[PDB]
Amino acid sequence: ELDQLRQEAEQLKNQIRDARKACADATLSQITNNIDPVGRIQMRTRRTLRGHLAKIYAMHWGTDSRLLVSASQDGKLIIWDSYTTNKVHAIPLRSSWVMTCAYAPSGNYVACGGLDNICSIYNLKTREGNVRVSRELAGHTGYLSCCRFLDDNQIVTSSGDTTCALWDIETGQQTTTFTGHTGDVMSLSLAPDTRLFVSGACDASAKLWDVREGMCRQTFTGHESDINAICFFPNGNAFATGSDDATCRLFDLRADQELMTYSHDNIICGITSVSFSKSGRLLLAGYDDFNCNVWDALKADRAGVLAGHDNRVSCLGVTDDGMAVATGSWDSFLKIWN
Amino acid sequence: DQRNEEKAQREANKKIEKQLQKDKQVYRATHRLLLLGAGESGKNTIVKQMRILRVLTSGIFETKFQVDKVNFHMFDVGAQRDERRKWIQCFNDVTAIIFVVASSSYNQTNRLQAALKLFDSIWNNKWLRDTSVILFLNKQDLLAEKVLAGKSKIEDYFPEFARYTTPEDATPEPGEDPRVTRAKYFIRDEFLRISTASGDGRHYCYPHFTCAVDTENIRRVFNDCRDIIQRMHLRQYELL
């Protein structure tokens, strides 16, 4: 009954294992000896964005690389002007336990959500001059971990109900469901072309999804514990995952293996946030150490440390033009590093 | 020109910061409570007694109380999965986690060990190491019946109960069977054995026994919250 299908599944797993092993001739760790290192990365806190009252859970840059949305457990989304440190908007939320926030790439909407199992879409451009809830996306049966705007009318959310979902905002109806994780899906990362995204879950695995097909394209293992953070290499052909096993890993979609493992014996704290610089040479990772380690993404060496937060670094965001790194922490502060 | 937009931004920022000052005044003045427990633990009882003085569609249930004009927002985490390790660290600045235990659901037949293990997870979570836990041992009305009638058999799943006697500081209600108070304070001492092993003065357990008709829980948490706050303040001055 069950055993035939379980053994067929393990045969397919071994086929995956051997198809993986046959491709493992020489990965980044030996190819990239021929490049000189990044050296020491000395970033400084140009701006500190104060105004949140609780731990900041999520943070998202605009596509103008100037406006930031930041979610704190106040039930507040603050739209900051990162250049002048001015708050552009302060949006009170109907639920204070917000775990994610997204800034629409058009700049007109901001998403948020969390333990309320609802993705609230706020309109930042109304005729009243007021920011009001444009939509509420309900249908997830677990907390909202990550929401990313695919455009003004489509948002991808990940939930603690082990699924992801593509929502048509204008209708409010969940258009696609991405099932296949066993644990809570903690993070989303949309590829630059937006045709794919990648979701890391509490099953210690990441899954590459095709948005328009609703199909799990690939599954990446190699992490030992919960995957808290995921982000795409700027070309969309690789992604990094930060996990609670105190390790970051870079996987390539085409090779279908982990290419690089960023770890250090003095690092026993999990990785909460993972971001790539514009070039993809620097991998920024926020830690439970309260610091953000900047890794040589090709050498797997620590290029630098963004220390200065007084609590858990919860959210990382590199601007789309690469100019700055916003880090938000449980110490209620955002810091712009450059 | 640029100074015009800068002055407009300063005006917006000043309005926002006034609203944020009012919101900080409201936020600091509010105690946030997490409500945790098993399904049969009687958290419905706790929320009912708090409000007096397939049904859960939202992932969070905020119920607000006012005790001595002190505002409390208690958040029942309904409509979530039984895997808590990721959304529990969301309540790491909450004033207290109110951990309601199905003490009489034991003979599941081992709800009590499940509650003990969840409790040990909550103490030793590095994000909840500063979070105090108000412990409500919730179902004395059935604990009495199963203990005195030979229905509980606490010794069956907790053999050291066979060597446990009522402690020197117990205050049983008049006429209560000594074995029932043995079971009560034995369960409380199991939870305190978990608590004391790793407290180190950062966070505290406030164990309490309650029942279906015990409304004063709304005050117990209040009292405990006050205690919590004071200890926090006493740590800021290094007095305690």
């Epitope: 066993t182 609670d244 | 999965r81 390790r85 979570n125 590095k126």
Partner: nanobody, 126 residues
Framework: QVQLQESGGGLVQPGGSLRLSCAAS????????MNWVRQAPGKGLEWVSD????????SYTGSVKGRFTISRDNAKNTLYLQMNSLKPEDTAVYYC?????????????????????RGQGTQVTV
Amino acid sequence: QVQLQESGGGLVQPGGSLRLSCAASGFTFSNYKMNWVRQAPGKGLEWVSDISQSGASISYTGSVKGRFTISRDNAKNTLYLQMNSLKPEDTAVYYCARCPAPFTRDCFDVTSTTYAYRGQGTQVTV
């Protein structure tokens, strides 16, 4: 790839003994607190026994104290549970579980329905 495989189960007579062995792969076995979970027939999952990273701290559910003995081998990356004086109420599916994060003492979600870092389980019938 976290993979835990239990072995050493089967049918035993009441009062007998069984050595349950848990082969771990895909993670640093010594970094993690390990434990044994029990799914009784018709019941939910229940936790049986904790062992820490080094094996110094060992805890049991009261139903199995003095009868079950849990041990580690961080050299072979294996977890053992020696069952003595096995009773009919010990008949269940036994799962070797790894609690989710390394270098921690909290071990949330180990007895959850859909916990990931838990084996397929072995049937032990008494």
